[PDB]
Amino acid sequence: EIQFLRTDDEVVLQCTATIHKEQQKLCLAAEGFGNRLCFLESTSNSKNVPPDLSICTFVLEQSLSVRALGGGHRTLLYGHAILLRHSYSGMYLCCLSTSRSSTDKLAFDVGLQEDTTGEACWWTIHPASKQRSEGEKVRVGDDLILVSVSSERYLHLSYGNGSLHVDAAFQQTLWSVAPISSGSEAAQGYLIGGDVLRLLHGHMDECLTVPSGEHGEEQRRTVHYEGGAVSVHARSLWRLETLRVAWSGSHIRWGQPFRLRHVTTGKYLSLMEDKNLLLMDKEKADVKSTAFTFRSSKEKLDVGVRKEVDGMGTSEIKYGDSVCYIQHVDTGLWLTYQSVDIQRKAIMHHEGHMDDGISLSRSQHEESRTARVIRSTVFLFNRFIRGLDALSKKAKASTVDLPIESVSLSLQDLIGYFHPPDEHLEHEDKQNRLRALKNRQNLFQEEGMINLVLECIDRLHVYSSAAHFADVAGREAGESWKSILNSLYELLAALIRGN
């Protein structure tokens, strides 16, 4: 009945907070690119608004004892020191040296970091109550205290006079660990929750997607099937997300409901009332409207609450080999196509076509990561452009969201991400990195990233000096004006280099 935690498992860390007088269960979150600091992701509201668990997922990489200064899936014990590697970025949860918190000032920031050298990235696990003691096994759903090895502070939910962040402070916070996947349950070519994938009519040679990264950002909401090069572009990528936190990263089965998120725009596949398909904002992505399922055929689910299996005895879904039928849970309708006598329209219907058979195709790590970096960049840069827009339209600088600091940080990360291989590498090694590089470039180009960079350049160029920008946007904005522009140019050069 009870579940322990072992090294190599994926987990999330949750706490409860009072927001507008009410309790919410939140995950410890962090983005790789563009800001290394931890923040929080609500999970309690999942039936109305789907949480993004990708930024919340950590692997317990090590679990060491007292005399120390992975192993074979050692079990977590109270009093052990742990290392948490962020799944999405390759980085680790660290107690940093900086203090961006006026509230406490004896608190240290907590964020992501790759330098794993000191003690800053180690945390010791401690009992919340008398019901657990040093040496005992940490159970799933145990309330935990985490203590930084370098700084002796608690992993702490801070009510910063604004609102909610995480830090390391001498006040404690109760965290509970939820399991996401097992480090010993292998992938083996099967569909796992959290996967980024493409959905194909294999025989028709096409994939489910949306209109190209061009005009009609509102137009980009519609859904259709398309053959050709789109099958190796970002816009045909979808992230499958289960409806629960626990085990959201294990094997998916026939009948098991899920949302499907369009990676590039971050919107969720949904059925409207007039019964047409449309991508919805996270804020409107309710279960009834966004929940779908795979079915081994179009027969009947009426066998009770008994596990569904294919024509072989296997309950899981295989990449490549399995034929799948997407069903909207709430209406029971099928995801089909319709001919408009390069592409054809995706629709929901009770009959369908005899060849609705979707084949699944796992995306590569490389293209998946890239697709996600694009979504972050577009989101951040759209805020930046909008903020710049309000300012030119005379809005009071204090009321405007202008993410100067994130923009500098993202551009640095982005430039690094497009850095060509240094000469001193072996020839075959350089060739490989040059290939990854071209792919990153192609995916960025197809998503219209060049025009977006040019758009940010143009908006900054309205101003004639740093001091002119300072006058409208404030001193700190003024002092990054030229460095942001330089970075924008550098990034733009990186996008086209070697074409």
Author numbering: 10 to 25, 26A, 27 to 78, 107 to 378, 387 to 544
The authors write:
Cardiac RyR2 channels open in response to the action potential during systole and mediate excitation–contraction coupling by effecting massive release of calcium ions from the SR lumen into the cytosol of cardiac myocytes. The N-terminal region of hRyR2 (amino acids 1–606) is the target of >30 arrhythmogenic mutations and contains a binding site for phosphoprotein phosphatase 1.
Here, we present the X-ray and SAXS structures of the human RyR2 N-terminal fragment encompassing amino acids 1–606 (hRyR21–606) obtained at physiological chloride levels. The structure of hRyR21–606 determined at 2.39 Å consists of three domains: A (residues 10–223) and B (224–408) adopting a β-trefoil fold, and C (409–544) formed by a bundle of five α-helices. The first α-helix of domain C (referred to as the central helix) is positioned in the centre of the structure and forms contacts with all three domains. Residues 1–9, 79–106, 379–386 and 545–606 are not visible in the hRyR21–606 structure. Significantly, despite the presence of chloride anions in our crystallization solution, there was no electron density in the close proximity of Arg420 in the hRyR21–606 structure to be assigned to a Cl− anion. In hRyR21–606 this site is comprised predominantly of Arg417, Arg276 and Tyr125 side chains that form a net of interdomain interactions that do not match those described for mRyR21–547, but resemble those observed in oRyR1. Thus, the N atoms of Arg417 are within hydrogen-bonding distances of carboxyl O atoms of the domain A aspartate, glutamate and serine (Asp61 OD2, Glu40 OE2 and Ser63 OG). The Arg420 NH1 atom forms a hydrogen bond to the main-chain O atom of Val300 and Arg298 NH1 of domain B. Moreover, the guanidine group of Arg420 makes a face-to-face stacking interaction with that of Arg298.
